[PDB]
Amino acid sequence: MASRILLNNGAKMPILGLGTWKSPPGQVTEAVKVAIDVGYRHIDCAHVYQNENEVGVAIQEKLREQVVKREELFIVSKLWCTYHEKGLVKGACQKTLSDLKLDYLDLYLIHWPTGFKPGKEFFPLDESGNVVPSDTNILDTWAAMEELVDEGLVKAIGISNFNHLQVEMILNKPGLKYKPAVNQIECHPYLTQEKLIQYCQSKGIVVTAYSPLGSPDRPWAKPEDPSLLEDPRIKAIAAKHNKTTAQVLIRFPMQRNLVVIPKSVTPERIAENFKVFDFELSSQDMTTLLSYNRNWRVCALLSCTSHKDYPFHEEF
Numbered sequence: 407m408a409s410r411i412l413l414n415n416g417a418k419m420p421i422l423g424l425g426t427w428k429s430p431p432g433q434v435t436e437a438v439k440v441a442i443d444v445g446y447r448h449i450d451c452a453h454v455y456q457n458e459n460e461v462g463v464a465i466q467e468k469l470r471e472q473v474v475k476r477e478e479l480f481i482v483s484k485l486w487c488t489y490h491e492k493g494l495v496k497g498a499c500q501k502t503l504s505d506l507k508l509d510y511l512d513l514y515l516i517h518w519p520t521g522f523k524p525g526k527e528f529f530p531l532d533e534s535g536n537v538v539p540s541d542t543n544i545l546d547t548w549a550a551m552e553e554l555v556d557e558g559l560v561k562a563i564g565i566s567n568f569n570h571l572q573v574e575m576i577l578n579k580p581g582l583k584y585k586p587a588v589n590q591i592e593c594h595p596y597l598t599q600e601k602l603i604q605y606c607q608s609k610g611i612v613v614t615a616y617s618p619l620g621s622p623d624r625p626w627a628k629p630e631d632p633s634l635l636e637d638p639r640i641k642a643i644a645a646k647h648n649k650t651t652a653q654v655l656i657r658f659p660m661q662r663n664l665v666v667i668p669k670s671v672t673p674e675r676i677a678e679n680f681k682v683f684d685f686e687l688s689s690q691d692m693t694t695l696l697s698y699n700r701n702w703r704v705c706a707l708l709s710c711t712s713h714k715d716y717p718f719h720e721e722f
């Protein structure tokens with residue numbers, strides 16, 4: 407297991423990164439410092455997470471301490487839905503750069519294919535509770551992302567939560583200049599994504615798996631929901647390998663040639679989650695884990711099911 411995967415822009419991306427959604431602003435600076443200290447070189451960020459300034463403090467301190475060089479880090483962020491208008495994309499990227507205290511991002515993703523009305527609110531609502539869409543086409547948003555590469559603000563661009571027809575729409579865009587480097591999608595043993603992964607990989611697009619532990623801290627968790635970390639079948643595979651269940655859940659996507667971005671603000675877990683380059687799941691283990699698929703999503707963007715670009719009506 408090599409530590410990085412080659413992207414279609416010629417850069418190498420670390421296959422294991424630190425997630426930062428829900429990481430409290432008072433804890434995420436230390437989390438990122440610890441992560442870098444214990445070997446992480448890839449941090450997954452987003453403007454909508456509201457903690458990029460604090461993530462940036464950690465990155466900057468480790469650069470200043472010369473724990474790492476900038477060229478060794480792979481920093482990812484995402485364009486929020488209220489900034490899909492072509493005239494807002496650069497400013498959104500620049501705000502993220504300012505907060506992260508960087509002069510470029512390694513990868514910048516369209517966070518969702520759905521554009522929303524611009525404004526202060528991340529989920530602008532009509533008086534009846536529906537999210538108010540933007541009329542900006544995702545192909546036009548893509549062209550705006552391409553400009554960021556050409557202006558030196560980002561080294562690579564990609565997409566997130568795009569279904570295969572939406573990926574196809576970009577790949578078939580008239581005058582396409584840069585293909586997406588990455589599609590970041592939810593993926594774990596309860597949402598195994600065989601079809602979409604195969605499609606993306608066949609096109610040279612690297613897939614990043616989010617919520618690989620099943621996001622137990624997701625705000626809308628219900629007591630009766632399935633729980634990967636507590637699944638006795640996964641615990642058994644972990645026990646066989648003398649690893650934790652979380653370590654198996656992280657190793658699983660790695661062996662599918664995916665990038666994976668487990669989130670933690672707990673120093674012991676941050677270190678645990680990185681210690682996954684010292685064992686191998688068998689083919690049988692892999693197929694067994696795949697067999698647990700139930701098409702269960704942490705992130706279904708339920709407020710946007712009527713949006714013309716809602717991604718999860720299609721089978722994949």
Ligand SMILES: NC(=O)c1ccc[n+]([C@@H]2O[C@H](COP(=O)([O-])OP(=O)(O)OC[C@H]3O[C@@H](n4cnc5c(N)ncnc54)[C@H](OP(=O)(O)O)[C@@H]3O)[C@@H](O)[C@H]2O)c1
Binds near residue numbers: 424566620
């Ligand atoms: N593109 C998108 O739309 C999108 C959507 C969702 C997520 N993401 C990205 O993917 C990242 C990961 O997904 P996620 O945050 O939803 O959930 P996750 O990484 O599947 O799970 C995070 C949860 O697991 C706990 N945890 C971490 N390591 C553990 C371990 N070794 N043992 C036991 N529990 C452990 C964390 O607790 P503590 O933090 O308290 O240690 C936290 O409650 C996000 O942070 C974000 O960067 C992107």
